[PDB]
Amino acid sequence: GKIIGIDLGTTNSCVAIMDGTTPRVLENAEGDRTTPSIIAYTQDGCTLVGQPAKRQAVTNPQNTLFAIKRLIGRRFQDEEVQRDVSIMPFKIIAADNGDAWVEVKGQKMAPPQISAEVLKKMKKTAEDYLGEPVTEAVITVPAYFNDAQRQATKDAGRIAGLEVKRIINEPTAAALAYGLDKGTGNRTIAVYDLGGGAFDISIIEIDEVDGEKTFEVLATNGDTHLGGEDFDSRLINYLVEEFKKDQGIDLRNDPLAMQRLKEAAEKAKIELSSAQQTDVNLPYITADATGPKHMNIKVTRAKLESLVEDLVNRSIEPLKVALQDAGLSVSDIDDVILVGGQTRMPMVQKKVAEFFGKEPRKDVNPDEAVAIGAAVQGGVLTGDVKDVLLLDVTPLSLGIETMGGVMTTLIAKNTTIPTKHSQVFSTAEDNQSAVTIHVLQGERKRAADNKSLGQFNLDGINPAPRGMPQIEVTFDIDADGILHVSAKDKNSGKEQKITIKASSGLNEDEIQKMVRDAEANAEADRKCEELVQTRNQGDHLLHSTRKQVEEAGDKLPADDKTAIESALTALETALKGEDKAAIEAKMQELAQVSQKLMEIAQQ
């Protein structure tokens, strides 16, 4: 088949495909090229994705999920997860194994399911355009995603009914999307990605040798929990503090008011990317005991810049670190490109431009470059583009915990992937039954200060003196950037089974069940689409019949008129409901009674 490309964003998602030799982004059902990454669960059993979900969020706050990318692959006790727990309208809860989940209508749900709903909308869009089924996709993740996040995204892709060929890092995808225009030559570029939830910086070299583009990632750094949402949060906090200051009401209790306030806040930020002053104007924001209250606050561009300056500065440090790891200076960067909606803010462009002493390119669409890059990568996997190769790296050092809590690096950060590293382990005590290895990702010197991938237990070590047996352990990092640990008896070659404990993520059982539930939800959503179309047919029939009655006038039996009008009203009532069977029944009855009218037509 064909491999579609999916930019799965914190805020907006996007799907692009490979029209032979020229990739194109596909508009969704509503005609938008970018689909909001919002997922709503209605009372009636339907599932809304994108702009509809965005519309009905105010009446269904607890069941409208957003920013799930900022929970996927994370633990419930993570600091950022707790801070979000206090903030979000929906209920974030700890799973059975400690992973961060969300509760919808009393059901516990894993982030890969929700993100899989979004993925399903993208896949269905691609199928509608293509006219044939789609089973294979390349999905984008931030460069700084840890192992558990990447594996969790891959699982979300599997629940979407997709065979995930490649997990691509967003700045890398944008890099080749930018690189297809360029001719033969050598360049070095800095990709600055500041989206709705994540920030990445990647230093990438693009050399052309024998008609074969080589995109080598020299370095990468970033923060997976820094994005537009936090700019929004700063402006929100300012508005709340000013409202409590002027009217005496802490607005953080009213969740509806907080929803209206986040909408207005982001709107004001975006409006301040091109104006010099806007007004946050919310009438009847809340109801005091004495009477309803109002908000009308002036915000200058300078005020917003002051409110988010430390956030902007938080992004400059990984530039220094990345240039250090790449062994380059600011003057070695031939081009710098901005990716992500949040880079549209004038201050971000100014701070970046002044760090590099250079003006970023202007011919890059930050909203559409990642997706088209993913589509092209899919083309590389199939074969339709043979002139491009991508050499990505892993962003985090992979090590094990040793005595004293210190961490020991096995594979350092910025190592080109896929890669393999083997090491010999042995027993430490006489007749040691088993050995346990603590595998983690991060740069900190204490094991507790890093992200634990888990404890791998090699049981079934027959008794022996301390230190005699030799077991070779092999650490693999595939092209997705995901770890695969295999073991083997060094001397003999007999394999060694590995038990993973204290780990994160879904397993095969959870996966299968959630695939089945995804299919069931798919059939249910088909039925919902059916009900919408049937409701349209009903409204058309109402209009047609009333028109025909007026045209008929007095020349219609009073009994017939009466019965038809009763049937009409019954049908209108059925059309206000959500029962397809009742609507169809009422339509049929209306036809039976309006037989005389349709006879009166007579051409």
Binding site: T214, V380, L381, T382, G383, L389, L391, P418, T419, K420
Partner: protein, 63 residues
């Protein structure tokens, strides 16, 4: 187990700039991503990398 220099095919005294040229073209030939075919290429490629990494480091190259 195989000679680093020989699997890339280098003079054994050629400078870093050349071994990088050889790595990039070999990475092209043996990348799993490119062929998409098998683990055999990814297993071979991982070693072509490992040779490129040891030979660009000055001290480890002396070893």
């Amino acid at each position: 187990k195989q000679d680093y220099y020989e699997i890339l095919g280098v003079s054994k005294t050629a400078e870093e700039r050349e071994i990088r040229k050889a790595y990039k073209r070999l990475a092209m030939k043996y990348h799993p991503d490119r062929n998409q075919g098998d683990k055999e290429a990814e297993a071979k490629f991982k070693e072509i990398k490992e040779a490129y990494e040891v030979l660009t480091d000055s001290q480890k190259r002396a070893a």
